[PDB]
Design a protein around this nucleic acid. Structure first.
Length: 189
RNA sequence: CUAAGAAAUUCACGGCGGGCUUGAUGUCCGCGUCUACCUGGUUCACUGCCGUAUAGGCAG
């Protein structure tokens, strides 16, 4: 109810990639721009999120402090995207901000990794380890994912993140490693 | 509400003996394929990590 400094990031189109690859590379610029930058009370907000469309966002809405956003505008590590996307300026926030939920949460929709560690620890067989794990223990989470196709697996992958409910009261807290919610809400407008 | 309505084909068996198909040959001449392109499908709604219970620092 006190962090009223926003830092928006408008996404323009480019012919060499869609918005999903720009959201993945900008996701790397956030994991290395915040995790390799510093500042716990700096979060991000995705305003084009839709759980029925599998989208991530059509315009970034950053939320930081006064100097937490006043010193990130002149970032030479924020270059490159100045030619690919567009920027803005600082603007005030309204009084009643709705308490929304946006953060990262990893789900375990695969029993093959726990079947590998369970084959190295439990000593399961083919039919005993294959039958000790039922088919209903795995599930695909249809949230807004990001194809973070980095140098761990060569093919395209998905993204996992869990959001929170909507509310009106303010409950602030410390941001996560990617500028999300982990016990503290964020405004959504 | 039908050219309506109904129905046991059964049993058995030795095909078998013999043969010379041969002789001879020219497939020939000629030919313009060519211009243009973003694979990033997800070459698996994903691949290995504290709990065989959904909680994660992952190479993402």
């Amino acid at each position: 109810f006190t962090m009223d400094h926003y830092l928006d990031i408008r996404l323009r189109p480019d012919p060499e990639f869609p918005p999903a690859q720009l959201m993945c590379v900008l996701f790397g610029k956030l994991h290395q721009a915040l995790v390799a930058q510093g500042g716990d009370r700096i979060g991000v907000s995705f305003p084009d999120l839709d759980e029925s469309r599998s989208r991530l966002g059509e315009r970034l809405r950053i939320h930081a402090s006064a100097d937490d956003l006043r010193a990130l505008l002149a970032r030479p590590w924020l270059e490159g995207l100045r030619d690919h996307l567009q920027f803005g300026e600082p603007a005030v926030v309204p009084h009643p901000t709705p308490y929304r939920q946006v953060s990262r949460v990893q789900a375990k929709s695969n029993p093959e990794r726990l079947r590998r560690r369970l084959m190295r620890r439990h000593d399961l067989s083919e039919e005993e380890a294959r039958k000790r794990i039922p088919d209903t223990v795995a599930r695909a989470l249809d949230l807004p994912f990001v194809t973070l196709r980095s140098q761990s697996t060569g093919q395209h992958f998905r993204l996992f993140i869990r959001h929170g409910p909507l509310q009106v009261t303010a409950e602030e807290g410390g941001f996560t490693c990617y500028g999300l919610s982990k016990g503290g809400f964020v405004p959504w407008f």
